[PDB]
Amino acid sequence: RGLTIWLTGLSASGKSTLAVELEHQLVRDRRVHAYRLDGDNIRFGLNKDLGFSEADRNENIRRIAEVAKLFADSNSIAITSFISPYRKDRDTARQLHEVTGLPFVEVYVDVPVEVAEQRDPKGLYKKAREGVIKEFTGISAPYEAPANPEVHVKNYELPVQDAVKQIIDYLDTKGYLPA
Amino acid sequence: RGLTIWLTGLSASGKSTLAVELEHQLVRDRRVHAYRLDGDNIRFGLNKDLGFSEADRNENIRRIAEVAKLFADSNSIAITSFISPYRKDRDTARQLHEVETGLPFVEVYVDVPVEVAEQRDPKGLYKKAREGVIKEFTGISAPYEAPANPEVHVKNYELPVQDAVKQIIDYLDTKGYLPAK
Numbered sequence: 341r342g343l344t345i346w347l348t349g350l351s352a353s354g355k356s357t358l359a360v361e362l363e364h365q366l367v368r369d370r371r372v373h374a375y376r377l378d379g380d381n382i383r384f385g386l387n388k389d390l391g392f393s394e395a396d397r398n399e400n401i402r403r404i405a406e407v408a409k410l411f412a413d414s415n416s417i418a419i420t421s422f423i424s425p426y427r428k429d430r431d432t433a434r435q436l437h438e439v440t441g442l443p444f445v446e447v448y449v450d451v452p453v454e455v456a457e458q459r460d461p462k463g464l465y466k467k468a469r470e471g472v473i474k475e476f477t478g479i480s481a482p483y484e485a486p487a488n489p490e491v492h493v494k495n496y497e498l499p500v501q502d503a504v505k506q507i508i509d510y511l512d513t514k515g516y517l518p519a
Numbered sequence: 520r521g522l523t524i525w526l527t528g529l530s531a532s533g534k535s536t537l538a539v540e541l542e543h544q545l546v547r548d549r550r551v552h553a554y555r556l557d558g559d560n561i562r563f564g565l566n567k568d569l570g571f572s573e574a575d576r577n578e579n580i581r582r583i584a585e586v587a588k589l590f591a592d593s594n595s596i597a598i599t600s601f602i603s604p605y606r607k608d609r610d611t612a613r614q615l616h617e618v619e620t621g622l623p624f625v626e627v628y629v630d631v632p633v634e635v636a637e638q639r640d641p642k643g644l645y646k647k648a649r650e651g652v653i654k655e656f657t658g659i660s661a662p663y664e665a666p667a668n669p670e671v672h673v674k675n676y677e678l679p680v681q682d683a684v685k686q687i688i689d690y691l692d693t694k695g696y697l698p699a700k
């Protein structure tokens with residue numbers, strides 16, 4: 341049975357890492373298909389005409405909610421992994437999934453802006469600090485944190501494993517998994 | 520690894536009839552996920568922002584192809600069911616698929632004479648179209664540009680629905696695209 345698992349968080353909070361690992365640990369021990377949507381899949385393809393302005397981030401997320409729904413529909417598990425900083429847009433995505441039913445599991449990949457910054461794998465934070473990148477989430481643009489996430493991962497000083505296992509463990513707390 | 524099967528043909532050429540049957544026979548006899556993309560799927564969701572401008576027409580086809588590829592990349596078999604009249608529109612679609620190596624894009628020409636199409640006409644569209652009730656209708660007040668060399672060219676008439684589906688599935692076997700039975 342199909343649902344969408346929606347990760348939301350700052351950049352360098354470790355979403356994509358979780359996604360990959362959530363997936364492999366799902367198809368390892370329950371063996372479902374799960375497909376997994378983030379920047380490579382989507383921003384170089386479907387969402388190629390979209391930048392990082394507010395309206396574009398709205399649309400970016402709009403489109404992604406619709407194709408995630410599509411994947412859950414096909415009885416796969418869609419695993420999204422975009423910053424998705426606008427609470428309204430995440431709430432709207434939920435509502436297209438939930439109108440006769442499709443779970444929407446919002447996972448807050450939570451780190452402090454300072455843990456992320458201290459990571460900064462591709463140097464965007466230092467660039468955002470300097471003004472080289474404009475409107476950067478958490479530095480010069482908003483991140484609107486989830487109030488009631490199905491799952492709240494404090495993803496710092498924490499093994500990706502216990503992280504994914506907080507997610508899995510929630511999934512069958514609710515019944516979406518096989519043996 | 521999956522692939523996209525791209526149906527193209529006039530209205531009432533029978534794309535969706537074969538799309539349905541194709542999934543059914545694929546999922547059923549080869550134990551392989553397939554999934555259908557069509558107007559009921561796509562027009563009021565992903566592309567509900569798109570209109571009838573030439574640029575929205577192109578963008579409609581563009582987006583459809585992208586999410587077909589995502590299905591293809593996810594290891595299902597995507598099956599699209601759009602008139603997709605413009606051949607430069609299926610060029611856009613073909614090209615982003617073939618892009619290690621790329622994903623197979625099987626263009627299927629669902630070929631019926633336009634007079635076979637109007638004679639079926641299950642929704643009365645061709646009738647509204649000859650009246651002018653409906654505007655810019657493929658084959659009547661807008662062109663269909665037939666594929667120059669489809670992977671599969673199905674003359675889908677005077678031929679049972681399940682035999683035309685076998686024509687397609689047999690071509691897939693030709694490429695090793697599918698698992699055995």
Ligand SMILES: Nc1ncnc2c1ncn2[C@@H]1O[C@H](COP(=O)(O)OS(=O)(=O)O)[C@@H](OP(=O)(O)O)[C@H]1O
Pocket residue numbers: 351352356379383392396397398400401421422423424425462464473474475476477481
């Ligand atoms: N202006 C700006 N603000 C925030 N992030 C930026 C920006 N410009 C490029 N990037 C890179 O894009 C990645 C986040 O992309 P998203 O599709 O998730 O953005 S969003 O969901 O519409 O908030 C994010 O992480 P990665 O893609 O994993 O490298 C950044 O690297």
Ligand SMILES: Nc1ncnc2c1ncn2[C@@H]1O[C@H](COP(=O)(O)OP(=O)(O)O)[C@@H](O)[C@H]1O
Pocket residue numbers: 349350351352353354355356357358459461495496497498499500503
């Ligand atoms: N639990 C963790 N503890 C420490 N570092 C982590 C953890 N999870 C991920 N990271 C690191 O954080 C960096 C950015 O993570 P990534 O998954 O690319 O972020 P996102 O996809 O959310 O932008 C990566 O280099 C990764 O190695």
Ligand SMILES: Nc1ncnc2c1ncn2[C@@H]1O[C@H](COP(=O)(O)OP(=O)(O)O)[C@@H](O)[C@H]1O
Pocket residue numbers: 528529530531532533534535536537600639640641675676677678679680683
């Ligand atoms: N091979 C076939 N033989 C006989 N009738 C067919 C065949 N394929 C489709 N049809 C019929 O043609 C009509 C329109 O086809 P449909 O699949 O709705 O067309 P479209 O290509 O417009 O999606 C339907 O009534 C369908 O049963």
Ligand SMILES: [Cl-]
Pocket residue numbers: 472
């Ligand atoms: Cl730079």
Ligand SMILES: [Cl-]
Pocket residue numbers: 601602603604
């Ligand atoms: Cl079309």
